[PDB]
Design a protein around this ligand. Sequence first.
Ligand SMILES: Nc1nc2c(ncn2[C@@H]2O[C@H](COP(=O)(O)OP(=O)(O)CP(=O)(O)O)[C@@H](O)[C@H]2O)c(=O)[nH]1
Ligand SMILES: Nc1nc2c(ncn2[C@@H]2O[C@H](COP(=O)(O)OP(=O)(O)CP(=O)(O)O)[C@@H](O)[C@H]2O)c(=O)[nH]1
Ligand SMILES: [Mn+2]
Ligand SMILES: [Mn+2]
Lengths: 166, 166
Amino acid sequence: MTEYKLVVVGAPGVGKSALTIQLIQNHFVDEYDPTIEDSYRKQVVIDGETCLLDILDTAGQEEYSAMRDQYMRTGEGFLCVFAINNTKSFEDIHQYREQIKRVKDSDDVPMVLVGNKCDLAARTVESRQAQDLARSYGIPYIETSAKTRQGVEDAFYTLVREIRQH
Amino acid sequence: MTEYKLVVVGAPGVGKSALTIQLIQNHFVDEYDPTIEDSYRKQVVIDGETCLLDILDTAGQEEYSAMRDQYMRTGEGFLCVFAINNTKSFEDIHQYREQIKRVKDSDDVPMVLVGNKCDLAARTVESRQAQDLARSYGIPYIETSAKTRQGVEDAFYTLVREIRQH
Ligand SMILES: Nc1nc2c(ncn2[C@@H]2O[C@H](COP(=O)(O)OP(=O)(O)CP(=O)(O)O)[C@@H](O)[C@H]2O)c(=O)[nH]1
Ligand SMILES: Nc1nc2c(ncn2[C@@H]2O[C@H](COP(=O)(O)OP(=O)(O)CP(=O)(O)O)[C@@H](O)[C@H]2O)c(=O)[nH]1
Ligand SMILES: [Mn+2]
Ligand SMILES: [Mn+2]
């Protein structure tokens, strides 16, 4: 069957693992549990196509930039995640986007900008900010909450459909 | 607030009204009740943006082609719906797509191809068929069921995001 190699990137603590586990294992992880590198494989049907989601859940931090080049090379689609209560993670988006373009030799990689934790009342990043950035990148913006599961399938399936029209 | 003028088009009986009512009024209509022209207005929040969905639910049939030019002129985004157990409705898609391009003076209008009734076991249109068409049109393909509500918000929000990157 068709297999989609999806990579989840973002600053440490934005909810990269929480999004993925919510998709795969249908529960919200509210535990401190930092990632090095986890792979998830799952058979799904998306718009009637049977396919495998091969998800690479990555680490945020300079520790990883080595592991990073390698895993971005083989990713077909990238979830670029920031947290809506973390302005620094929002500004860090540019850095991940540039490393991806570098390793992919591409101005246009299938990519979704994900504003996570949208359930929290204390936003420091306005949706309009993130939406303007997304439009300047030429990619969709999707807000998510791993906590309530709002936007979680949306973000992943939208990325799979981006890879399909690439 | 931002307002998105969305038009739902398709052959008669594909589930145009069922999709819209499911979105708006959270119930599946299993009654014979043909449409001439219904408008739905609803305040939503999509990816943190407060906006109004202004939905034009249209009639299928040559009766309407007059009413059709007029309403396609002002639509910003179009849901092009066929039913997965109706090959004729699938072939009719081309005709709607061409009339839209004609009235819009545009090779590229925000548009999603929607394969409806995906809950029915008796498919006569393979997902792969519809997916190839979607890629040749350069638009997303989304399968839906107004009955189970699978893919309904997906189809509408995806169209709103298409209008946003247009
Ligand atoms: N309320 C809220 N908190 C969330 C959400 N998603 C993640 N969190 C919380 O943020 C913290 C970090 O989540 P985690 O999924 O581990 O993030 P990470 O980005 O993968 C962390 P690391 O980069 O080290 O791998 C956890 O306490 C988690 O419960 C969300 O949408 N809502
Ligand atoms: N099982 C199933 N039947 C559906 C689905 N959506 C629509 N139907 C059924 O198809 C029939 C037509 O639905 P309707 O929403 O009225 O279609 P329409 O395309 O708007 C018809 P008209 O063009 O005349 O306005 C109804 O009996 C409805 O219950 C669906 O996803 N699943
Ligand atoms: Mn993690
Ligand atoms: Mn109708």
